[PDB]
Ligand binder design. Structure first.
Ligand SMILES: [Mg+2]
Ligand SMILES: [Mg+2]
Lengths: 240, 231, 195, 250, 212, 226, 117, 244, 204
């Protein structure tokens, strides 16, 4: 079998294949996560270079791993499917053996572990994907939001963004997100998430996707018109 | 140059550079001495610390009741090779009720090291070993190189500045070979031998490591205040 | 495990399963639920060898739940029953086969029809208006052959089921400690807590 | 030891070219000319027996090969590569078809199997592509007579008539002027001999030309009588004398 | 062998006898039939002594690894399923095991799982396993209430094993008592059946069939 | 089943009956037991019928590939060697008992092979449940230097002995003659001594005799256009 | 290119020496041993204020009597920790005792040079 | 040893791109143009054969349009041999699903499976990727008529109208201009042929240079029919739409 | 215990003038217990018809296997499989499980679409082909079917006459078998029309 060490150290102590995988993430469409007091919102950018697209059937950017946890990503789309499938299988395996659904931290730790493994195994390249994993632990009302990257490191975030122009939207979030008082309602959280994407997106039309996750497996994706109403209200307050 | 990328490539003059580079790792290692009489065999080793807060890296490994070695170079490679010797000594005792001859132990170490010098993907071992033992033909001392070359000697030294100790043993040859039935005097000769390789530093109580095996003496290692008597 | 019965009426499928667990000499439990929900509108009851029954049922449950998450879609009762049949047909030529018999009761939301499938441990599948495994059919089928109508209500189905259980309690030598009854219809799965 | 070449030796270059396949096609271009023509009641395939030495017995070197009783093959390019492909093609006709369906494969499907083998030598680890192009002629009950070309990439195309190798460009133009959908097998053989003469330098006779047909069933070549449904092979290699007879009416 | 475990208001009572036999020969009267999996989990020995000892110690190791990895006490549900899944892999090979995995956690409360070598895993309130199981069930079923005190529940478990020890030839020696709380199990001593029988006979007035 | 092989002047002949059975029931009344390994190498099989057919077709397939590889006409000794090594490996679990006969550039050959992998040479051989009846005829009338006509006569007489005397054998005689320097001639139903007599009565029913619940057209055509 | 297990002319393994450079870029960790106990401390070094810092886990329990702190590419430590925890628990299973701190450390270090092609 | 000759087909560039995937996409840009258009009452697949000959047997020839099952077809752009490897695998996957669940495979599940196979060759194994882009035209009872595309990276997306192969930039602009949501199959047939006629590198668009297919519920009642057009039928539709 | 008689059932096939017929009962049982009266044992792949008797799990498995294989055949060959070719495929598929066989008795029936010739064939559980000119029988009442067919059959029967002959052969054979009956289906097959008829019969 093909055993070639593709991920190796360089004289300055860097693993370039892992670092180049991060550059693939930089190219991917922007993804953002914001947790309120009783919810988490995942926002995603859709590049409008592709019209004549059939939006009914085209792969959506946010994926349910279980009924209570969701995963979004920035980077190589094909690579993300492999991580999503593995995470979904592990979620069912956990329910089968522990008789309890995964915690958000456990699912994050697993996906991050797969990513790390692909950085020191022979004959494989690292995933060109960073992920945002959000949801609620079983029988818990505390919001959870984690981030993973190609190297395999992971951590928890009050709010976070990944992908192209994520430096700009992180700038916005760092000055607009208060830890002592997070977005108290679904409305406030969605509004802050749409606002953060409007710093980067272009037209607020079919370019912004929004998914809201609440406790006890309550997950819903907002439609074009619902998001369009947030887009309308934000700019009418801005004209002042 | 163009021929040192792997162990599977001869140079135009018939040299194996990866093996020569592995030999270089031994020269960077701390000095260790081996010598024997007709009744006993002794190892003396200068242990190296990282700094003043750190411990002194152990140099001597026991392989059986009648055999053991000292190392110079990559310590994890010594652990792999000494583990193999422990297994081979053990196989001989379990299957044949027989203590493994020191000479046969040298042959086994040679062949294990050789396979890593003729195949793609692998690398040579980066450590040198001094094996002492007492078997059915008396006391023995062996020197192992990761090229595969194993040699039986009265005395020797490997590591940094080992040439000073080696010359001393070459002078004293006729004296220390006759030190029969006197373990303390044989160790004294070994401590005096390793002293010919010291610069700036001297032998302290946590610096010195001594091992001995003989006629009615199991392989035992002395460290700490047990070597103060010889300082 | 012992008695498992099924009946498909106008608008629902009803599954009845005994509560007893007997390990040789003693009845260790009298409240055992011999069923697993595979999807919101599909229920599977089971009986056979100890250990293998629950192991097989939970394995199937895990697989259907995995499919549901992957596709964001509930498989039809027919599709689930075919998946289960193949797993048992595969198992019968294994080193150690699953000795498990199942009934699959589901409501097809596309066709708006209840469906009942009977599958034994060999992988023998049939779609039926009513079914059973083991000796249960020997006592109950003559009653079902007489009274059954395809246009029966759920309440009439439960009444015909009571008559079947009464005949079992009369003529069967083993005490199966009553049955747990569950209904599968357009609104999902619910348990009848007084039977 | 062990084969430690588990990686592809054919890869895409910046321009999108697969170098090793292009170079294999170059080897085919240097090869001796071979051709095929399809008639209403048969197919003909032909090539030159370029003998490496006059001391060599060129009858012992078969450039035109029977794959099945109703399918034959000819090549241009590397001879050894062709020989092993003929071995693999003969075997796969049995293992992946005759041992399953109890009958020989139709021409298009055997071509498909040979094509797959050639494709894999273009992607699998530690191998180079085959340096040949094949022309495969055949007949089967439901598809009738057919002629196919297979290239080093694994791509294949059906032809009414075509040529490969050395003088293929000129030969294909010659065939375009002469071919029609009303040709009888004897007319196609005549055109094949006319076309092949243009690319041959030296001797042109039955001993230097290799020619075979897919035509009528040959009960005389079956080797047994008694089964009415078995009527014999449609593949027949023409003799040295049979070629020379048609060179007088040339 | 006689082993039992039951759930009640104050947690779980585990009671076992102490006798091991090889045919008619009494090999030991001092067998430890409660396996201390960890300070919070208990398992009972019936069937194969080695199979129970080995795999329930192993279970303790798996539970310790779980809490190191997840930074949280393992549930009784998860712990019992690790054992039942393991023995299911060996089904057909000849393992012999009938055990109650007992624990008391925050999310579950007091919980008992009967785990068995043919793969069975059953949650329940009262379980009794062994050659003397039917005798202990009789005393349990007729005296069990959820609202038993810790003192009375401990005695009920002791009395039920005594009933089995008296009638079942292959049960006896001594009685080992345990009380499982949320903060861990508490050992309630070794009680010689010989001495216990006479004591219970006099104080209770039972066993009038036996002369003392 | 009755099968025989007989050597003659310039070749070899093989013959067989045409009855196949399942226990006491006759499954097929005109079975073909003479199989072709190659054009001029034929064999007849007794025992498990699927095994005799399968092992014939497998070795026949490999023999054809071998013939193409070597540019030589297949030899009987090659078929024999390949059959026996295949059968030996399966330790009798493939229940094929065969008489193998044929002509090749080396000459004419006749062999028998048993399920466990042992082989034998002979001028006359018989196999199957009717082999003892057939061998009785062969041992009575065989001589050295038989003509083609004499060998065909002897072979078919030996099969007839099986047909009339063995319950496992019946119906017709099939023959295949393999002569040196000639095409092998397969003579299907060479003898037909067991035609059923006309029945006493016609059992054609009046139309409408059978009770019918439902009629419907079955769509065997593919999904249609427009 | 060149082997992953190649020696330099100085007698050092290129890849090992390069990994030591990656560790120099890692956040600081400190340990001090006393006769009353051993203390372990780390720098968390969050990349942004929105990152919840209590999710940064650079000090980890191996067993009740053994702790561990890390510095460098911290994702690489996860399989090392997993091995250490397994080795500690396995030795307790086999020997009904705590494993020695040195023996645990030696077991972790056996993984180190298991790389190549 | 062997490392010396390894091209390393599965590595990132410094910019985070996959060399071999990018170069395979460059190859596909020279292949004949294939177009798919989805309408309310069906789907159209139209594709251009690459510079042909008069001696090519067209009526038995297939290089662009392939049947995966009765409900799903594909248009190919790239290496034909590479495509046939993947096509056979897809045909098997469809039959595996039908055997397991006793229902025809949903279009997206087939597309995801083939796309995952393409992905694997970019991450592990050290082999070159498949130089193929697919247009998938299919029907199932969940989403109805569907169009997808996949490329050597293993990424896939859904479309109302799409092109692959040569001149996709020009083709996509023309499709974006004239496509409407309430369009019908007969209108989509015309749009596809008009777009190929304008984007082609040939002098004129004739029947012998085209492959054509429709997926219609124009099958008598509640079912779907696939129609791979014959050479004479492509000639007729060219006259009907007024291109020849 | 005997796998070939756990579920019960029968299949029969016959040839006529420019036509073939194939018929089966509808019973599935668990030994003495009747379980289903709608278990059809005849399947078709294009114009080729396959009846299967024996262990019901294997009947279903083999139908799914041959649907699988004939679908791939059609995609690759670009034509429907013929009766002669399909017969060899069944034989090959059965023999590949030589030492762990499917416990079945398959029967093939159909007309070759090119020659117009009527075709029938039978198999044992491991693949041996019986290609009879007249009729093929299979199942737990195969002895009874052999008796009926041998006396009732005559060559060159017209389609509507062949229907009566095969129907009476099935019905009366099934009524002498405990594990067969509970309904019956007859297929009359001509070159481009196939008629399916459910028969009325006793239900014990
Ligand atoms: Mg009957
Ligand atoms: Mg009856």
């Amino acid at each position: 079998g093909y055993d070639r060490a593709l991920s190796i150290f360089s004289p300055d102590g860097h693993i370039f294949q892992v670092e180049y995988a991060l550059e693939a993430v930089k190219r991917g469409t922007c993804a953002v996560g914001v947790k309120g007091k009783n919810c988490v919102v995942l926002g995603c950018e859709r590049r409008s270079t592709l019209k004549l697209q059939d939006t009914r059937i085209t792969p959506s950017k946010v994926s349910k791993i279980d009924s209570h946890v969701v995963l979004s990503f920035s980077g190589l789309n094909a690579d993300s499917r492999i991580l999503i499938e593995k995470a979904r299988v592990e979620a069912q395996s956990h329910r089968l053996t522990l008789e309890d659904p995964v915690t958000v931290e456990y699912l994050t730790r697993y996906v991050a572990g797969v990513q790390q493994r692909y950085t020191q195994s022979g004959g494989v390249r690292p995933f060109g994907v960073s992920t945002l994993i959000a949801g609620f632990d079983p029988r818990d009302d505390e919001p959870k939001l984690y981030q993973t990257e190609p190297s395999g490191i992971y951590s928890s975030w009050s709010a976070q963004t990944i992908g192209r122009n994520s430096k700009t939207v992180r700038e916005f979030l760092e000055k607009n997100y208060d830890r002592k008082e997070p977005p108290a309602t679904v409305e406030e959280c969605v509004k802050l998430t749409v606002r953060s994407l409007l710093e980067v997106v272009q037209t607020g039309a079919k370019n912004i996707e929004i998914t809201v996750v609440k406790p006890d497996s309550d997950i819903v994706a907002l439609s074009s018109e619902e998001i369009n109403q947030y887009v309308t209200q934000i700019e009418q307050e801005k004209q002042e | 140059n163009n021929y040192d990328g792997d162990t599977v490539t001869f140079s135009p003059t018939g040299r194996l550079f990866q093996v020569e580079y592995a030999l270089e790792a031994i020269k960077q290692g701390s000095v260790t001495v081996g010598l024997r009489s007709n009744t006993h065999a002794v190892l003396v080793a200068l242990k190296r610390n990282a700094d003043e807060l750190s411990s002194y890296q152990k140099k001597i490994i026991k392989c059986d009741e009648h055999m053991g070695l000292s190392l110079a170079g990559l310590a994890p490679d010594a652990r792999v090779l000494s583990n193999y010797l422990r297994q081979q000594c053990n196989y001989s005792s379990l299957v044949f009720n027989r203590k493994l001859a020191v000479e046969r132990a040298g042959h086994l170490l040679c062949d294990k090291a050789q396979k890593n010098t003729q195949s793609y993907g692998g690398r040579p071992y980066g450590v040198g070993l001094l094996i002492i033992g007492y078997d059915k033909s008396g006391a023995h001392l062996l020197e192992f190189q990761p090229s595969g070359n194993v040699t039986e000697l009265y005395g020797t030294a490997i590591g940094a500045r080992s040439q000073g100790a080696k010359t001393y043993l070459e002078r004293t040859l006729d004296t220390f070979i006759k030190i029969d039935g006197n373990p303390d005097e044989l160790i004294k000769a070994g401590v005096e031998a390793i002293s010919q390789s010291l610069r700036d530093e001297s032998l302290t109580v946590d610096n010195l490591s001594i091992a001995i095996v003989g006629k009615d003496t199991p392989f035992t290692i002395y460290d700490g205040e047990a070597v103060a008597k010889y300082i | 495990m012992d008695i498992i019965l099924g009946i498909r009426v106008q608008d629902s499928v009803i599954l009845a399963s005994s509560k007893a667990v007997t390990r040789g000499i003693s009845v260790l439990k009298d409240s055992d639920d011999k069923t697993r929900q595979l999807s919101p509108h599909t229920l599977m009851s089971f009986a056979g060898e100890a250990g293998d029954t629950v192991q097989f049922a939970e394995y199937i449950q895990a697989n259907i739940q995995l499919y549901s998450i992957r596709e964001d879609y509930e498989l039809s009762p027919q599709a689930v029953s075919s998946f289960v049949r193949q797993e048992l047909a595969k198992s019968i030529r294994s080193r150690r086969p699953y000795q498990v018999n199942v009934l699959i009761g589901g409501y097809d939301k596309k066709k708006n029809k209840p469906e009942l499938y009977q599958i034994d441990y060999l992988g023998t599948k049939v779609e039926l208006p009513y079914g059973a495994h083991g000796y249960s059919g020997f006592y109950t089928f003559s009653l079902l052959d007489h009274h059954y109508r395809p246009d029966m209500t759920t309440e009439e189905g439960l009444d015909l089921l009571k008559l079947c259980v009464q005949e079992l309690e009369k003529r069967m030598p083993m005490d199966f400690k009553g049955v747990i009854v569950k209904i599968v219809d357009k609104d999902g799965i619910r348990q009848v807590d007084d039977f | 030891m062990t084969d430690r070449y588990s990686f592809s030796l054919t890869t895409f270059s910046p321009s999108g070219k697969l170098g090793q396949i292009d170079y294999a096609l170059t080897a085919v271009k240097q090869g001796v000319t071979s051709l095929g023509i399809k008639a209403t009641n048969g197919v003909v395939i032909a090539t030159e027996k370029k003998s490496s030495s006059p001391l060599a017995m060129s009858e012992t070197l078969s450039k035109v090969s029977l794959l099945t009783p109703d399918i034959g093959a000819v090549y241009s390019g590397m001879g050894p590569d062709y020989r092993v492909l003929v071995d693999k093609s003969r075997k796969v006709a049995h293992t992946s078809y005759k041992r399953i369906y109890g009958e020989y494969p139709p021409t298009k499907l055997l071509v498909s199997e040979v094509a797959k083998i050639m494709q894999e030598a273009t992607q699998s680890g530690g191998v180079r592509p085959f340096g040949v192009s094949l022309l495969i002629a055949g007949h089967d009950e439901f598809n009738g007579f057919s002629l196919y070309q297979v290239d080093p990439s694994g791509s294949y195309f059906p032809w009414k008539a075509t040529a490969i190798g050395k003088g293929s460009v000129a030969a294909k133009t010659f065939l375009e002027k002469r071919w029609n959908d009303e040709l009888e097998l004897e007319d196609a053989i005549h055109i094949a001999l006319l076309t092949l003469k243009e690319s041959v330098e030296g001797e042109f006779n039955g001993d230097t030309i290799e020619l075979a047909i897919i035509g009528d069933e040959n009960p005389d070549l079956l080797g047994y009588t008694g089964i009415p449904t078995d009527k014999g092979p449609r593949f027949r290699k023409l003799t040295s004398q049979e070629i020379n007879d048609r060179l007088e009416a040339l | 062998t006689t082993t039992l475990a039951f759930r009640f208001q104050g947690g779980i009572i585990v009671a076992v006898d102490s006798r091991a036999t090889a045919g008619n020969w009494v090999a030991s009267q001092t067998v430890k039939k409660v396996i201390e999996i960890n300070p919070f989990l208990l398992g009972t020995m019936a069937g194969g002594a080695a199979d129970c000892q080995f795999w329930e110690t192993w279970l303790g190791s798996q539970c310790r690894l779980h809490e190191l990895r997840e930074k949280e006490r393992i549930s009784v549900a998860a712990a019992s399923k690790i054992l039942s899944n393991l023995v299911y892999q060996y089904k057909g090979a000849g393992l012999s095991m009938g055990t109650m995995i007992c624990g008391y956690t925050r999310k579950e409360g007091p919980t008992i799982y009967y785990v068995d070598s043919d793969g069975t895993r059953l949650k329940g309130d009262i379980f009794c396993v062994g050659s003397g199981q039917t005798f202990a069930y009789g005393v349990l079923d007729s005296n069990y209430k959820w609202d038993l005190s810790v003192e009375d529940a401990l005695y009920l478990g002791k009395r039920s094993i005594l009933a089995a020890a008296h009638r079942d030839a292959y049960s006896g020696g001594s009685v080992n008592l345990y009380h499982v709380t949320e903060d861990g199990w508490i050992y309630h001593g070794n009680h010689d059946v010989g001495e216990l029988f006479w004591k219970v006979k006099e104080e209770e007035g039972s066993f009038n069939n036996v002369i003392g | 089943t009755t099968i025989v092989g007989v050597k003659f002047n310039n070749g070899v002949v093989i013959a067989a009956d045409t009855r196949s059975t399942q226990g006491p029931i006759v499954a097929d009344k005109n079975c073909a037991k003479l199989h072709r390994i190659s054009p001029k190498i034929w064999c007849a099989g007794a025992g498990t019928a699927a095994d005799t057919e399968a092992v014939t077709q497998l070795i026949g397939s490999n023999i054809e590939l071998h013939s193409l590889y070597t540019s030589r006409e297949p030899r009987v000794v090659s078929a024999l060697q390949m059959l026996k090594q295949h059968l030996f490996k399966y330790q009798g679990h493939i229940g094929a008992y065969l008489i193998v006969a044929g002509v090749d550039p080396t000459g004419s050959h006749l062999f028998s092979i048993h399920a466990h992998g042992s082989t034998d040479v002979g001028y006359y051989l018989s196999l199957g449940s009717g082999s003892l009846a057939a061998m009785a005829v062969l041992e009575s009338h065989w001589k050295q230097d038989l003509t083609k006509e004499e060998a065909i006569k002897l072979a078919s007489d030996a099969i007839q002995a099986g047909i009339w005397n063995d319950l496992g054998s019946g119906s017709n005689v099939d023959v295949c003659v393999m002569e040196i320097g000639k095409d092998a001639e397969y003579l299907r139903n060479y003898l037909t001594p067991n035609v059923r007599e006309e029945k006493q009565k016609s059992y054609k029913f009046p139309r409408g005799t059978t009770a019918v619940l439902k009629e419907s057209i079955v769509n065997i055509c593919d999904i249609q256009e427009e | 290119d060149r082997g992953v297990s190649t020696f330099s002319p100085e007698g050092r393994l290129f890849q090992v020496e390069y990994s030591l450079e990656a560790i120099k870029l890692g956040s600081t960790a400190i340990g001090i041993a006393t006769k009353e106990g051993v203390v372990l401390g780390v720098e968390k070094r969050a990349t942004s204020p929105l990152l919840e810092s209590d999710s940064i886990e650079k000090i980890v329990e191996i067993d009740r009597h053994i702790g561990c702190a890390m510095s460098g590419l911290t994702a690489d430590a996860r399989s090392m920790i997993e091995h250490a925890r397994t080795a500690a628990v396995t030795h307790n299973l086999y020997y009904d005792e705590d494993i020695n701190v040195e023996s645990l450390t030696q077991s972790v270090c056996d993984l180190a040079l298991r790389f190549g092609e | 040893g062997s490392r010396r000759y390894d091209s390393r087909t599965t590595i990132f560039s410094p910019e985070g791109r996959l060399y071999q995937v990018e170069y395979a996409l460059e190859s596909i840009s020279h292949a004949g143009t294939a177009i798919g258009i989805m309408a309310s009452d069906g789907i159209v697949l139209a594709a251009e054969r690459k510079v042909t000959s008069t001696l090519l047997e067209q009526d038995t020839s297939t290089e662009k349009l392939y049947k995966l099952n009765d409900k799903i077809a594909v248009a190919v752009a790239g290496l034909t041999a590479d495509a046939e490897i993947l096509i056979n695998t897809a045909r098997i996957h469809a039959q595996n699903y039908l055997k397991t669940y006793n229902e025809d495979i949903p279009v997206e599940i087939l597309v995801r499976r083939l796309s995952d196979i393409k992905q694997g060759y970019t991450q592990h194994g050290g082999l070159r990727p498949f130089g193929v882009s697919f247009i998938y035209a299919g029907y199932d009872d969940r989403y109805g008529y569907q169009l997808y595309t996949s490329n050597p990276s293993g990424n896939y997306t859904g479309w109302k109208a799409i092109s692959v192969g040569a001149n996709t930039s020009a083709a996509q602009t023309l499709l974006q201009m004239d496509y409407k949501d309430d369009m019908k199959v007969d209108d989509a047939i015309e749009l596809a042929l008009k777009t190929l006629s304008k984007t082609t590198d040939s002098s004129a668009l004739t029947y012998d240079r085209l492959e054509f297919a429709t997926i219609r519920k124009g099958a008598n009642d509640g079912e779907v029919y696939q129609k791979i057009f014959k050479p004479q039928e492509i000639k007729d539709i060219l006259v009907k739409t007024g291109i020849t | 215990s005997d796998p070939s008689s756990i579920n019960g059932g029968i299949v029969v096939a016959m040839t006529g003038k420019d036509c073939v017929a194939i018929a089966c009962d509808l019973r599935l049982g668990s030994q003495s217990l009747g379980v289903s009266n709608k278990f059809e044992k005849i399947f078709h792949y294009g114009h080729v018809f396959l009846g299967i008797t024996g262990l019901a799990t294997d009947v279903t498995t083999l139908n799914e296997m041959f649907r699988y294989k004939t679908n791939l055949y059609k995609l690759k060959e670009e034509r429907a499989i013929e009766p002669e070719t399909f017969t060899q495929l069944v034989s090959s598929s059965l023999y590949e499980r030589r030492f762990g066989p499917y416990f079945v008795g398959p029967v093939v029936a159909g007309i070759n679409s090119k020659s117009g010739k009527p075709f029938i064939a039978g198999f044992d559980l491991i693949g041996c082909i019986d290609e009879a000119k007249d009729f093929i029988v299979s199942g737990t009442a195969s002895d009874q079917l052999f008796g009926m067919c041998e006396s009732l059959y005559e060559p060159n029967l017209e389609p509507e006459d062949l229907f009566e002959t095969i129907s009476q052969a099935l019905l009366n054979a099934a009524d002498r078998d405990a594990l067969s009956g509970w309904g019956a289906v007859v297929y009359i097959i001509k070159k481009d029309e196939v008629v399916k008829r459910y028969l009325k019969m006793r239900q014990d």
